[PDB]
Amino acid sequence: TGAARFDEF
Amino acid sequence: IQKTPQIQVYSRHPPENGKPNILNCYVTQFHPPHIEIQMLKNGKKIPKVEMSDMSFSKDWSFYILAHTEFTPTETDTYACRVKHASMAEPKTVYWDRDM
Amino acid sequence: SHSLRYFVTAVSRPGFGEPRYMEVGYVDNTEFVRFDSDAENPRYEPRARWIEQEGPEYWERETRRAKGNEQSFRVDLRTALRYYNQSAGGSHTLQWMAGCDVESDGRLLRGYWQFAYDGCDYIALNEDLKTWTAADMAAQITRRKWEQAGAAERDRAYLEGECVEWLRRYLKNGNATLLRTDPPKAHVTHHRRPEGDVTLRCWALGFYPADITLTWQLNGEELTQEMELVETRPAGDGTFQKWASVVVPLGKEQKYTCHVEHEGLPEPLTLRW
* Residue A8: closest C-alpha in chain C: C76
d(CA C232, CA C178): 18
Note whether C119 and C205 are same-domain residues: no
Note whether C211 and C166 are same-domain residues: no
Closest Cα in chain B, distance from residue C162 (Å): 22
d(CA C97, CA B44): 38
d(CA C194, CA C215): 25
CATH number at residue C233: 2.60.40.10
Between A and C, how many CB-CB pairs are < 8 A? 51
Note whether C189 and C165 are same-domain residues: no
User: C-alpha distances in angstroms, C188 versus C245, C253, C256, C261, C271?
Assistant: 9, 11, 11, 16, 7
Q: Out of C132, C158, C179, pick the residue that ends a domain.
A: C179
Note whether C216 and C108 are same-domain residues: no
Give the single-character DSSP code of C160.
Answer: I
Q: Do C22 and B60 touch (CB under 8 A)?
A: no
Who contacts C198 (Cβ-Cβ below 8 Å, separation ≥6)? C190, C191, C192, C247, C248, C249, C250, C253
Give the single-character DSSP code of C255.
Answer: G
d(CA B14, CA C136): 48
Q: Among candidates B82, B85, B79, which has minimal Cα distance to B9? A: B79
Who contacts C8 (Cβ-Cβ below 8 Å, separation ≥6)? C21, C22, C23, C24, C69, C73, C95, C96, C97, C98
Note whether C104 and C29 are same-domain residues: yes
Residue C245, SS3 per DSSP: strand
For C143, the domain range is 2-179
Torsion over CA: C146, C149, C151, C152 (sign): positive
Residues of A in contact with C154 (CB under 8 A): 6
Note whether C146 and C197 are same-domain residues: no
Note whether C171 and C83 are same-domain residues: yes
Note whether C31 and C54 are same-domain residues: yes
Q: Do C201 and B24 touch (CB under 8 A)?
A: no
Who contacts C128 (Cβ-Cβ below 8 Å, separation ≥6)? none
Number of structural domains found in chain C: 2
| Per-position DSSP letters for C174-242, written without gaps between them | THHHHT--BPPEEEEEEEE-TTS-EEEEEEEEEEBSS--EEEEEETTEE--SS-EE---EE-SSS-EEE
d(CA B66, CA B10): 11
Exposure of C51 in the CB half-sphere (CA atoms within 13 A): 21
> How were these coordinates obtained?
X-ray
CATH number at residue C107: 3.30.500.10
Give me the sheet containing C221-222, strands edge to edge.
C221-222, C213-218, C256-261, C269-271
d(CA C91, CA C15): 10
User: C-alpha distances in angstroms, C231 versus C137, C182, C213, C221, C265?
Assistant: 35, 18, 11, 22, 20
Residues of B in contact with C204 (CB under 8 A): none
Note whether C169 and C196 are same-domain residues: no
d(CA C149, CA C131): 13
Resolution in A: 2.3
Who contacts B30 (Cβ-Cβ below 8 Å, separation ≥6)? B3, B4, B5, B6, B61, B62, B63, B84, B86
Note whether C215 and C248 are same-domain residues: yes
Q: Out of C179, C209, C234, pick the residue that ends a domain.
A: C179
Q: Out of C141, C157, C179, pick the residue that ends a domain.
A: C179
Which residues, in sequence order, are bridge partners of residue C47? none
Residues of C in contact with B13 (CB under 8 A): 205
d(CA C60, CA C63): 5
User: C-alpha distances in angstroms, C17 versus C13, C87, C94?
Assistant: 7, 16, 17
Q: Do C7 and B55 touch (CB under 8 A)?
A: yes
- Alpha carbon distance, N-terminus to C-terminus of chain C: 34
| Per-position DSSP letters for B8-49, written without gaps between them | EEEESS---TTS-EEEEEEEEEEBSS--EEEEEETTEEPS--
